[PDB]
Amino acid sequence: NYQPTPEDRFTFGLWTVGWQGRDPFGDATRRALDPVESVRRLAELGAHGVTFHDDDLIPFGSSDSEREEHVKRFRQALDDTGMKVPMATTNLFTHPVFKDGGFTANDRDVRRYALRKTIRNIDLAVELGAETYVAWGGREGAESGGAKDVRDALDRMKEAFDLLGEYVTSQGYDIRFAIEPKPNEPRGDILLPTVGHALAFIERLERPELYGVNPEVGHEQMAGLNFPHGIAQALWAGKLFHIDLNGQNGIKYDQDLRFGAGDLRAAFWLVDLLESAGYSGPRHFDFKPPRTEDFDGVWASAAGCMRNYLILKERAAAFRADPEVQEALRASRLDELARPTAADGLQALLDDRSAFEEFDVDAAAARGMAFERLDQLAMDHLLGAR
Amino acid sequence: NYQPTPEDRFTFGLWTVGWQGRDPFGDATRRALDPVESVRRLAELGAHGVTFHDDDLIPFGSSDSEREEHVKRFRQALDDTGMKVPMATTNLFTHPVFKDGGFTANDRDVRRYALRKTIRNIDLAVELGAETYVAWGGREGAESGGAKDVRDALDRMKEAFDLLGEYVTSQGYDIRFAIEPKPNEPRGDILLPTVGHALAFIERLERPELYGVNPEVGHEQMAGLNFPHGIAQALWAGKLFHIDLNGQNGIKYDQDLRFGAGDLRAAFWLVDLLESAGYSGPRHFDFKPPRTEDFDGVWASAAGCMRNYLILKERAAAFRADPEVQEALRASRLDELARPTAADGLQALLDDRSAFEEFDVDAAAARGMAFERLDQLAMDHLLGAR
Amino acid sequence: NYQPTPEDRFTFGLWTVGWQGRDPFGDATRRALDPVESVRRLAELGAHGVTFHDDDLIPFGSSDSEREEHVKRFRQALDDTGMKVPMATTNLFTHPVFKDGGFTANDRDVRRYALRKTIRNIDLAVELGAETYVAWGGREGAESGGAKDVRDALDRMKEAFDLLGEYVTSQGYDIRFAIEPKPNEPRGDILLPTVGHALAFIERLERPELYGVNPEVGHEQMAGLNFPHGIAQALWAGKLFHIDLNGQNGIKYDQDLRFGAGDLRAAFWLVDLLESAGYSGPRHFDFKPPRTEDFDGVWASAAGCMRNYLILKERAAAFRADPEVQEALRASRLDELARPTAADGLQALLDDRSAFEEFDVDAAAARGMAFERLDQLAMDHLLGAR
Amino acid sequence: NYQPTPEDRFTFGLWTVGWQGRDPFGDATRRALDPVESVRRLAELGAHGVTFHDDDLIPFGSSDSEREEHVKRFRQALDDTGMKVPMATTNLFTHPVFKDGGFTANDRDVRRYALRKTIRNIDLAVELGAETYVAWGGREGAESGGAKDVRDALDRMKEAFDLLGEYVTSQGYDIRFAIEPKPNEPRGDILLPTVGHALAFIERLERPELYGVNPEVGHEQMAGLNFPHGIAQALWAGKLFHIDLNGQNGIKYDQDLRFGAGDLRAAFWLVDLLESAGYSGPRHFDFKPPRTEDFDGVWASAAGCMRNYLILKERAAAFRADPEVQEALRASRLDELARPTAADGLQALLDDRSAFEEFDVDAAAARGMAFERLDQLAMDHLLGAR
Ligand SMILES: OC[C@H]1O[C@H](O)[C@H](O)[C@@H](O)[C@@H]1O
Ligand SMILES: OC[C@H]1O[C@H](O)[C@H](O)[C@@H](O)[C@@H]1O
Ligand SMILES: OC[C@H]1O[C@H](O)[C@H](O)[C@@H](O)[C@@H]1O
Ligand SMILES: OC[C@H]1O[C@H](O)[C@H](O)[C@@H](O)[C@@H]1O
Ligand SMILES: [Mg+2]
Ligand SMILES: [Mg+2]
Ligand SMILES: [Mg+2]
Ligand SMILES: [Mg+2]
Ligand SMILES: [Mg+2]
Ligand SMILES: [Mg+2]
Ligand SMILES: [Mg+2]
Ligand SMILES: [Mg+2]
Ligand SMILES: [Mg+2]
Ligand SMILES: [Mg+2]
Ligand SMILES: [Mg+2]
Ligand SMILES: [Mg+2]
């Protein structure tokens, strides 16, 4: 009954089930979790692996000896459980030194520090077997217009990512970078605010093949955008390296609800797309168990992430396999959308009188698209009414 | 007193001052304008030129003889006034045949018709001297998830733009394309919904140098995004070919208010950016005089577009020239943002102990950014309190 | 299998299935429906009744003889089908005379005309058996700040509704008024923009008992508000006289999707609330079949409205009847929420040392609310996974 | 030059300039301010007074002896500076015990504790001379639909406010309550989310005359609503007891920018309304100096709040005094909006053939409203171009 196994590739950040519940108006409601306990409890729930920021695993300001001790404890728990570490990232947002950003801070010495802190954790990530290194520039942005020249900031952002790309290639590391966009919060506006802006920025880097995107459900929905559409564009570009799954109720602060909460139909179409396209990376949950919950509610919330993915996977597969749905897809001409508009070429199109001079515009206009019947079949499948 | 002249390059679409006021809940409140009158009245207001959709100038379904007559009347008014036509575009959204899109309609014969209708108007645009050809795919999208496979739709969109690029290069035309993004309306979600998505898509075309963006103030604000930030990214990529200026009050239907209305401070920072960067293209207003207005209010609204641009231009220039502002920009380290993070290179950065091992993180963290003082100087300049 | 019958009280506006598909960017895609055909087709689908604006039934500017003919044809179709007319309303938004509003137009003669047009249709509504008369002030508002003094406009709005209340009581009519809020569109901002503002306004009328609200799913969601919460407040006040059911995908133009589309989980909690509270009025669909559809898609879309209500009704009933859910509701202390905080009174509360001086604040703080487990049980029931 | 004096009645919360800069993603960037220093520094800037939560002034868990010491220190600083305390409020949101609310927590013992904590601070507020007691129910709400029965929660909310009203009247206190709405954050949805919902709720309390609203600029804008319109409705109802001034850039997390930032034109129309209506209460700033700033930037930001109010006050007064604006107001028939629609009464309106049978609907429809000219005069005045 919708039981996850490690083969489903479900992963969780240490900072997710470990969120203590401190929000901008309230103190923590839960004690801190030891990373080792989190690994053990997630393994028992059926997770495949965990992810981390450097500062989740090694407390900021630790000596090199305490650092080695923290990593050894962690690696032992991974060995004991069989859990993997597919992705790692850098905390460039919590410490007050990053209050105006890391890679695009106005202060040059902070930008250099940001790069050195990142490079140190890339080495550790590689040692733990991570294949993707995520960058979320949560402090790269501004509250006011004159504080940040955005062209200069983009030069600095490109400079930082180019240097990281030079570092991994000169070390011979087999790791790729994924940029995680977010439109706002904690800065008034954040640079590279959507999947689109991130994809466009990647094409201006020196080695674009090393960089993709790590889109998050809730972040694109904070701009009112269609998350499955944005994922489709990322797949079309060959840039979907990783994904952050959660839920969000509309345009407001980043809620990070468990996956399946928030916009349920968008979650259905997302799963349909990921499974149809054969996305093979981790199904990573970046979520926060609400601060109303005790530790029992934390693990119930984490289990619900995986359960909802598996239910939606079943419903989307039943939808696509239903002969009546396949007939409706042809009724709505989805098959024609997949055929080239003009494989005969430009000159033949120009000479084709059935394309313009003799095109019956009123007869084509009268054809219904039959989209509402198709969408109700999708609703029936989602709700288990078929 | 803030009087425009043709040298300011202010342009208007025929469909703007010509909007009859029909909205989804109401009949037209104004009679149709003859395009010739619009050209004459705009010339008297100080405009530089006009833009058009094919169907604004030539009524849909006109014979080739009526078509020639409509163009000749138009060209005579241009000659009489000295007005230019810097941009043209295609109507691929009003006729019911385009109800599921033009370039990405599920029906293949509609997609071919869409291309032939576009190519016919590219010829006319070139004949009238237009340098930019805009494409707004307002019907390319969906209300429901199963109606549109977005990867196939993007293949079709790329196919269409590649064919248009092949057409202009084989004809030897000196015209470039600009894609105008919009997140939604009239479709539930529109493909390429923001500047970012459009910029990323352009990099996958066969001849990317032929294509840029035509961002619109209100459209990016319908996604809650920072319009000056998005323009900065378009300039950074070298893709700001044209711009649509207007006003918008937040996340709601596309209001198309006169420029300066809506988000006034965003308008200030936009003008500051366009003038600082030396944008040399048309300052094009895509706006709708509210349907409360008679024809006197139409021309008052059009005049206000240009007036507000010129006032904001003066205030932004005074801001940047103020020695106290220049001092505050250095206080906030905008000069340091423009300097390379690591021109000494990767190895020197790795060997630089002042970048990490000996970096005083508490002293850097205590430095204030002085952004609020800078922003209040900007406010004082905008309001004329300095 | 989820078949509606007239006993389910499903009703539709004539303007819904009759929407021809004209939007702000496109011509109609469907021919006009005769109101008589709409009544017949809806009766065959299982609807209970229809609603109308005056101008849906009697074309604007009809003579008194044509008017009588239109009503007689309509009444014959009602007699032939058994369909009821539970609600009627006035079109105070389509004609250009209403461009600045009806009840709050700046021009006094327009406000008087608006009242006379309304009163004429109240007489007809009563003759057809309507129990609720809806007012949607879609043109009452402004695009700019100086155009409308809102205190004066509210005086005029109160004056209009007071006069309507005097009219129905002096005629001895058994009809009540329902105000339908909407935050924006077609005006930049609309007066009484949410359920809350409407409820507050009603308390200042001379006869508040005659007035309630007609909330619409999509309208509250255009302000990012929680529609079931707003309905709960309307029920708590005893003011839910009527309801408009449809779907909406977030903060954007008013989509009027079929009910169940848009925010599916909000639709579930709405149905749960309406059925639990014993709301006995019409389940009215104010929706627009998308303009992609032909007439077959129109009736498929209307049928889907009713189907989705009935599926959600079944799932909500199963949720509330599940013993495991009843146990979880007690685990989350929903039973304690329903018990008075201080039925012992103020003085006993002040003397209760267990309420403050001896209250163990750390022990109460450690109690988990168990909300995530409860919400996953609700998800399982919605998806038919239990 | 726009210098505030105590006669302008500018007030600040202790928690505003005292905000240490901890946000959901970052540690504090500023040390804590002693309340006594804040009073002294604000007095030097020209403020009139300060406001406080109980927990701002007396650290949570203080003994009665430490409590007396904290109040005495505070009162001495008030005496030394001449600063007043016009408003006080309760912190019912920071401590983990309030994680599911205070007045509407599911746990009954928490609701009783919430009432006792409030009543204790009402006594202190009265002792310090406060005239208004604000309640912001920031934790009253839910992230999921089944967690909170909203009708029961509203019963509990009414019960709490009724008990507070009984307490102040039995003590003979001359203090009134103001409810501060907010739509979301930190809860997914907050009860009484807008001015409208709060106004409607007040009419169901046992002693409605004791309760009004404390609207906040940014909170109504988090729902995309027109803040001056909402203030106008609060004034129309006689319920504007207090106001929170700040700035907000659209629909996103609560930014609490300094007043004048965010939506500048809305700030202009707000000041125009408050001054025209003769609002005589405190001009209270609930803002957060961005965490980029050091203490010099904190006081620059606080000074900017007051400066921007005074500049906008001057521009709005010049607008209303300009003879050309007065002429334009009559051109747009603002004078007619203020005249009764039907002072002649219902029967005379029914008998008035010029109101319907002989009303020239086409001639009235052709009249322009001249709103765009009026709005450009308002723009010219705001920018100092007239
Ligand atoms: O970059 C890794 C993570 O860092 C922070 O926790 C962000 O809140 C999250 O969105 C991001 O995915
Ligand atoms: O593409 C040219 C224009 O076409 C339509 O009028 C759109 O509404 C406008 O946004 C666009 O700029
Ligand atoms: O008032 C009845 C109806 O009138 C209009 O059709 C509105 O768009 C709809 O929202 C409203 O319910
Ligand atoms: O109630 C007083 C204040 O409490 C909290 O600080 C809120 O964030 C603020 O909005 C409110 O005004
Ligand atoms: Mg996130
Ligand atoms: Mg997030
Ligand atoms: Mg994330
Ligand atoms: Mg537009
Ligand atoms: Mg627009
Ligand atoms: Mg445009
Ligand atoms: Mg509606
Ligand atoms: Mg609607
Ligand atoms: Mg409606
Ligand atoms: Mg606030
Ligand atoms: Mg706030
Ligand atoms: Mg406040």
Judge whether D251 and B249 are in contact, CB under 8 Å: no
- Cα B291 to Cα B22: distance, rounded to the nearest angstrom: 8
What DSSP string describes B19-60? Answer: ----BTTB--SSPPPPHHHHHHHHHHHT--EEEEEHHHHS-T
Q: Considering just the CA atoms, what is the radius of gyration of chain B in Å? A: 23
- Cα D342 to Cα C384: distance, rounded to the nearest angstrom: 58
CA quadruple D91, D97, D103, D104: dihedral sign: positive
Joined tokens for residue C186: 């077609």
Q: Residue C263: left if φ>0, alpha if ψ -120 to 50, beta else—which one?
A: beta
Q: Of these residues, A53, A242, A284, A381, which one is catalytic?
A: A53
Residue from D98, D120, D226, D271 whose CB has the most chain C CBs within 10 Å, to mutate: D226
Joined tokens for residue B112: 């071919």
State the catalytic residues of D.
53, 56
Give the residue, by CA position, lying nearest to ligand 1 atom 5. A136
**Cβ of B140 below 6 Å from ligand 2:** no
**Which ligand number lies closest to the CA of residue C13?**
3
CB pair distance less than 8 Å for B375 and D296: no
At D301 the three-state DSSP class reads helix
Spell out the residues 6+ positions from residue C8 whose beta carbon is closer than 8 angstroms to its own: C46, C48, C283, C306, C309, C310
Amino acid identity, position A376: Q
Judge whether C332 and C370 are in contact, CB under 8 Å: yes
The C-alpha angle A222, A223, A225, rounded to 5 degrees, equals 105
Q: Residue D73: left if φ>0, alpha if ψ -120 to 50, beta else—which one?
A: alpha
CA quadruple C320, C323, C324, C328: dihedral sign: positive
Indicate the DSSP class of residue C33: P
Strand pairing category for B141-142 and B189-190: antiparallel
- Cα B350 to Cα A112: distance, rounded to the nearest angstrom: 10
**Cβ of B254 below 6 Å from ligand 2:** no
- Residue B57's CB is within 10 A of a number of other CB atoms, namely 21
- Cα D82 to Cα D386: distance, rounded to the nearest angstrom: 39
Q: Of these residues, A54, A55, A56, A263, which one is catalytic?
A: A56
- Cα A140 to Cα A156: distance, rounded to the nearest angstrom: 11
Amino acid identity, position A356: F
Please list the helix, strand and coil fractions of chain D in percent, rounded to the nearest 5, in that order: 50, 10, 40
Amino acid identity, position B259: F
Joined tokens for residue C216: 């619409």
- Cα B265 to Cα D376: distance, rounded to the nearest angstrom: 16
Alpha-helical runs (H) found in chain D:
14-17, 35-45, 54-57, 64-81, 108-128, 150-171, 195-202, 217-221, 227-236, 264-277, 295-321, 323-331, 334-337, 346-351, 361-366, 371-383
- Cα C168 to Cα C174: distance, rounded to the nearest angstrom: 8
Taking the centre of ligand 2 as the mean of its atom positions, its distance from the CA of residue B136, in whole angstroms, is 6
Q: Tell me which chain C residues have a C-beta less than 8 angstroms from the C-beta of A285.
A: none
The C-alpha angle C43, C48, C52, rounded to 5 degrees, equals 90
Amino acid identity, position C118: T
Taking the centre of ligand 4 as the mean of its atom positions, its distance from the CA of residue D136, in whole angstroms, is 6
Judge whether C260 and C247 are in contact, CB under 8 Å: yes
Q: Residue C128: left if φ>0, alpha if ψ -120 to 50, beta else—which one?
A: alpha
Joined tokens for residue D289: 């100096």
Judge whether D345 and D39 are in contact, CB under 8 Å: no
- Cα C366 to Cα D97: distance, rounded to the nearest angstrom: 8
- Cα A143 to Cα A154: distance, rounded to the nearest angstrom: 17
Judge whether B159 and B112 are in contact, CB under 8 Å: no
Facing residues of B141 across strands?
B190
Q: Is A292 on the interface with D (CB under 8 A)?
A: yes
Joined tokens for residue D114: 């919430």
Amino acid identity, position D336: E
- Tokens 């220049």 correspond to what residue? B326
Q: Annotation-wise, does D107 bind a ligand? A: no
Q: Is A223 on the interface with C (CB under 8 A)?
A: no
| Closest residue in D to C267 (Cα–Cα) | D145
Give the residue, by CA position, lying nearest to ligand 1 atom 1. A136
Binding-site residue ranges of B: 180, 216, 219, 244, 254, 256, 286
Atom of ligand 3 nearest to the CA of C53: 2
Find the distance separating the first CA and the last CA of chain A, reported in whole Å.
19
Question: Which contiguous run of DSSP H or E holds residue C206?
Answer: none
Q: How far is D175 from chain B (nearest CA, A)?
A: 36
- Cα D167 to Cα C350: distance, rounded to the nearest angstrom: 10
Judge whether D105 and C334 are in contact, CB under 8 Å: no
Taking the centre of ligand 16 as the mean of its atom positions, its distance from the CA of residue A219, in whole angstroms, is 26
From C96, C100, C253, residue closest to B253, measured CB to CB: C253
Q: What is the largest CA-CA distance in chain C?
A: 80
- Residue C45's CB is within 10 A of a number of other CB atoms, namely 17
Q: Considering just the CA atoms, what is the radius of gyration of chain D in Å? A: 23
Taking the centre of ligand 15 as the mean of its atom positions, its distance from the CA of residue D254, in whole angstroms, is 5
Amino acid identity, position D41: R
Judge whether C255 and C247 are in contact, CB under 8 Å: yes
- Cα D369 to Cα D357: distance, rounded to the nearest angstrom: 24
- Cα A201 to Cα A160: distance, rounded to the nearest angstrom: 13
Q: Tell me which chain C residues have a C-beta less than 8 angstroms from the C-beta of A263.
A: 263
Judge whether A238 and A199 are in contact, CB under 8 Å: no
Q: Annotation-wise, does C256 bind a ligand? A: yes
Phi, psi of A223 (to 5 degrees): -105, 10
- Cα A97 to Cα B362: distance, rounded to the nearest angstrom: 7
> What is the second-level CATH architecture of the domain C1-386?
Alpha-Beta Barrel (3.20)
Phi, psi of D21 (to 5 degrees): 95, 15
Give A278: exposed, middle or buried? Use CB within 10 Å, 0-12, 13-18, 19+: exposed
Judge whether A103 and A111 are in contact, CB under 8 Å: yes
Against chain C, the chains showing at least 3 CB pairs within 8 Å are: A, B, D
Joined tokens for residue C356: 């403050």
- Cα B197 to Cα A170: distance, rounded to the nearest angstrom: 32
Q: Tell me which chain C residues have a C-beta less than 8 angstroms from the C-beta of A265.
A: 261, 264
Please list the helix, strand and coil fractions of chain C in percent, rounded to the nearest 5, in that order: 50, 10, 40
Spell out the residues 6+ positions from residue A120 whose beta carbon is closer than 8 angstroms to its own: A54, B356
Residue from D64, D67, D92, D144 whose CB has the most chain C CBs within 10 Å, to mutate: D144
Q: How far is B385 from chain D (nearest CA, A)?
A: 8
Joined tokens for residue B123: 């010829």
Alpha-helical runs (H) found in chain B:
14-17, 35-45, 54-57, 64-81, 108-128, 150-171, 195-202, 217-221, 227-236, 264-277, 295-321, 323-331, 334-337, 346-351, 361-366, 371-383
Question: Which contiguous run of DSSP H or E holds residue A162?
Answer: helix A150-171
CA quadruple D364, D367, D372, D373: dihedral sign: negative
Judge whether D138 and D93 are in contact, CB under 8 Å: yes
Joined tokens for residue B250: 């937040």
Phi, psi of A213 (to 5 degrees): -120, 155
Joined tokens for residue C245: 């059911």
Judge whether D239 and D233 are in contact, CB under 8 Å: no
Judge whether A305 and A287 are in contact, CB under 8 Å: yes
CB pair distance less than 8 Å for C236 and D151: yes
Residue to mutate (ligand 2; options B52, B133, B179, B180; most atoms within 8 A of CB): B180
Joined tokens for residue A225: 């955008």
- Cα C237 to Cα D204: distance, rounded to the nearest angstrom: 8
Q: How far is C96 from chain B (nearest CA, A)?
A: 5
- Residue B295's CB is within 10 A of a number of other CB atoms, namely 15
Q: Residue D333: left if φ>0, alpha if ψ -120 to 50, beta else—which one?
A: left
Nearest to C381 by CA among C330, C312, C329: C312
Q: What is the largest CA-CA distance in chain D?
A: 80
Judge whether B251 and A251 are in contact, CB under 8 Å: yes
Joined tokens for residue B310: 């010129």
At B259 the three-state DSSP class reads strand
Q: Name the resolution in angstroms.
A: 1.7
Find the distance separating the first CA and the last CA of chain C, reported in whole Å.
19
Facing residues of A285 across strands?
A12, A245
Q: Tell me which chain B residues have a C-beta less than 8 angstroms from the C-beta of C139.
A: 25-26
Facing residues of A247 across strands?
A257
Residue from D15, D25, D254 whose CB has the most chain A CBs within 10 Å, to mutate: D25
CA quadruple A180, A185, A186, A191: dihedral sign: positive
Judge whether B100 and B139 are in contact, CB under 8 Å: yes
Amino acid identity, position D369: M
Phi, psi of D207 (to 5 degrees): -130, 75
Facing residues of D88 across strands?
D52, D133
Residues B67-88: b if buried by 16+ CB within 10 A, e if exposed: beebeeebeebbeebebbbbbb
Residue to mutate (ligand 3; options C136, C216, C253; most atoms within 8 A of CB): C136
At D95 the three-state DSSP class reads coil
Q: Considering just the CA atoms, what is the radius of gyration of chain A in Å? A: 23
**Half-sphere exposure at residue B292, Cβ-oriented, CA atoms within 13 angstroms:** 29
At C106 the three-state DSSP class reads coil
Residues in chain B: 386
**Half-sphere exposure at residue B347, Cβ-oriented, CA atoms within 13 angstroms:** 2
CB pair distance less than 8 Å for D300 and B29: no
From C154, C163, C372, residue closest to D342, measured CB to CB: C163
At A176 the three-state DSSP class reads strand
Atom of ligand 1 nearest to the CA of A53: 2
Residue boundaries of the structural domains of chain B = 1-386
Q: Annotation-wise, does C180 bind a ligand? A: yes
- Cα C102 to Cα C55: distance, rounded to the nearest angstrom: 15
- Cα D382 to Cα D316: distance, rounded to the nearest angstrom: 7
| Closest residue in D to B294 (Cα–Cα) | D368
| Chain C, window 119-138: residues with a beta carbon less than 8 angstroms from a chain D beta carbon | 119-120
- Cα C222 to Cα A348: distance, rounded to the nearest angstrom: 47
Judge whether A267 and A312 are in contact, CB under 8 Å: yes
Nearest to C82 by CA among C44, C114, C54, C35: C44
At A124 the three-state DSSP class reads helix
Judge whether C92 and C137 are in contact, CB under 8 Å: yes
- Cα A335 to Cα A320: distance, rounded to the nearest angstrom: 14
Judge whether D260 and D247 are in contact, CB under 8 Å: yes
Q: Annotation-wise, does A185 bind a ligand? A: no
At B89 the three-state DSSP class reads strand
Joined tokens for residue D193: 């989310």
Judge whether C20 and C31 are in contact, CB under 8 Å: yes
Q: How far is B38 from chain A (nearest CA, A)?
A: 30
Find the distance separating the first CA and the last CA of chain B, reported in whole Å.
19
- Residue C62's CB is within 10 A of a number of other CB atoms, namely 14
Joined tokens for residue D305: 């709040």
Q: Is C339 on the interface with D (CB under 8 A)?
A: yes
Q: Is D187 on the interface with B (CB under 8 A)?
A: no
Question: Between D371-383 and D295-321, two packed helices, what is the crossing angle to 10 degrees?
Answer: 140
CB pair distance less than 8 Å for B250 and D375: no
Facing residues of B216 across strands?
B244
Q: Annotation-wise, does A155 bind a ligand? A: no
Phi, psi of C2 (to 5 degrees): 60, 45
- Cα A195 to Cα A218: distance, rounded to the nearest angstrom: 12
Distance of CA C370 to the CA centre of its chain: 33
- Cα C45 to Cα C300: distance, rounded to the nearest angstrom: 10
Joined tokens for residue C310: 């009935």
Distances, alpha carbon D231 to alpha carbons C151, D137, D225, D317, in Å: 10, 20, 11, 19
Residue from A19, A25, A254 whose CB has the most chain D CBs within 10 Å, to mutate: A25
Atom of ligand 1 nearest to the CA of A219: 10
- Tokens 């030396």 correspond to what residue? B278
Facing residues of A381 across strands?
none
Judge whether B213 and B195 are in contact, CB under 8 Å: yes
Q: Is B143 on the interface with C (CB under 8 A)?
A: yes
Q: How far is C357 from chain D (nearest CA, A)?
A: 9
Judge whether B227 and B275 are in contact, CB under 8 Å: no
**Half-sphere exposure at residue C307, Cβ-oriented, CA atoms within 13 angstroms:** 19
